[PDB]
Subunit: 330 residues, 2 copies
Amino acid sequence: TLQGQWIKVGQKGGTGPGPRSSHGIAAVGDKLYSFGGELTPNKHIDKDLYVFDFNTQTWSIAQPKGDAPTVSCLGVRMVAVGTKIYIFGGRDENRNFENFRSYDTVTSEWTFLTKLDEVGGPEARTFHSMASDENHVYVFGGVSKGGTMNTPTRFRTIEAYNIADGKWAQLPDPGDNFEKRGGAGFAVVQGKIWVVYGFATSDDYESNAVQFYDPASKKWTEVETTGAKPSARSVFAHAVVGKYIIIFAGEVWPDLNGHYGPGTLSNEGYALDTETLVWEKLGEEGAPAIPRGWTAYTAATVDGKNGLLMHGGKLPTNERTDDLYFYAVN
Amino acid sequence: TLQGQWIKVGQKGGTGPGPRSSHGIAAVGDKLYSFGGELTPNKHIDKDLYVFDFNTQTWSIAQPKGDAPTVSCLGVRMVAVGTKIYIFGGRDENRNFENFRSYDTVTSEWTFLTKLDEVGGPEARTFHSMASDENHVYVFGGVSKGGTMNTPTRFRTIEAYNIADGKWAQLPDPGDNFEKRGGAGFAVVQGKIWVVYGFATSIVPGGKDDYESNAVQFYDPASKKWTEVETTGAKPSARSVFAHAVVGKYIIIFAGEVWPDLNGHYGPGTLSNEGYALDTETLVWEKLGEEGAPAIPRGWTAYTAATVDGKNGLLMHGGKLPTNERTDDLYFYAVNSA
């Protein structure tokens, strides 16, 4: 069984993002980068790239050199490969949708990489999920713009960006028996791409569906998991550590008013062993008490340990938080 | 290891309670009895004794012979011993509090047993918990009657009613390190009395800091002493007002309130749709299997141990939903391992 604990990461000042949900973070080395956010329900905040340095445990704002983002986003996501971070999707309150961009942590420069919602290209999106490997950025699910006269729909497909080629290609469509989902767990584990739970169309509902896509065979497997298996949920913090997909919190039941209310949130964590398909429940020690969902999340290494880094989110009071927590894995 | 599944028990008509929460149920033989309820938040409904017959799967109203209840109650609870069921506590919208009464399923008659909130006698109460064994009805925790005479407070103690003696006595006070709680799990397991989680009073006066508890203790009649226990396994986060029952060595729980509402019992708070079982011998929790499980989170259900279609398990009725609506769902977790 997995062994680890929660640690509340002190924030000792500087120019920080403050409380927000629905944003994207990712870690490069000793630094955490944060982009996007929602404070007032369904209202954006800003388009600064915030940087948290773990050594000083303080916040600053990165220099917006190059093709800096033009839209203040909610529902945007972010991943890191090498020294670059990549943001995909998100929208502002006026329904300007962001595109596909990279920021280089060394040169502090932004590059516009792909315009979304073009013909034969990946659609613009909110509340998708992102994963990556050494040469790919992956995008799963989400809620389309989109469009323009097909109503906003969810996606059941994966879009693969080959970094060296600078090209997108859609991976094979899993088909009619797979839920189009937003707010899903999504991760690369030991060469396969896992989709875990989410919010599905088909009265729209939390899903407990688990699948992987296998690049070697170019095909999808629907998986039956066991153990301390969490009830269906979405918009949960999640990250890969080894063979484990670790999740925490999330929405267990949707709000009667969409994203305006808090719905029903969770304060519990779980870990899926992708080798055995067994779930186990994370320990309570150090865990944040107040249920949350819509946090930002990323795999990170802090003070020597791998684990799940979680920031912000909304609370059952519908308030946002600026809590930064780390589940450190032994 | 524990083996079971949820079954939605069909309800085929008659005069049933409809949707409600915060009521008391208990089973005698092939019948389920239901008293009390809350539909509109903090409003009572009625004072009928409802009876659900598992053979016909239909509802009727028991005739109120003898000293019938006088108060339409929310926050009342019920236990069954032998052929009698017992109701304790509860209050109506106007803060009239019910007392201690039993209904004899053989004679179909109510008997008044104890007037509550008398001097040296057990205090009146809302959202306490009840358990029982062959010669006792036990009452734990709850929220006391509110006067200006100080304020409504919670209890950390157990009150024991000896059935043969017709007498109440408070069991030893576990003391300052045990939380005063309402909505607690409470059960007699193999000769000891277990207290599980609940909603606790904070040391900080005011109420704003009152919180879900994950404390687990038992009282041992053999030593007359309390033991606080550290449980492991797939251990649920702190919660209260969950359905629960004993099967063998297992305390089985389902659903409940994981986080309180800023508007007290007026709003839905944060509810759960997951079940767990505490193995009281090993102190290991396991998560109940999902099969047939009610999807929509709930809390404030009525609950009882029951035997249905040959199997023992947890019977759960009604409760409130995240939409703040009530349900009339009747669910049974049938344990095959029995």
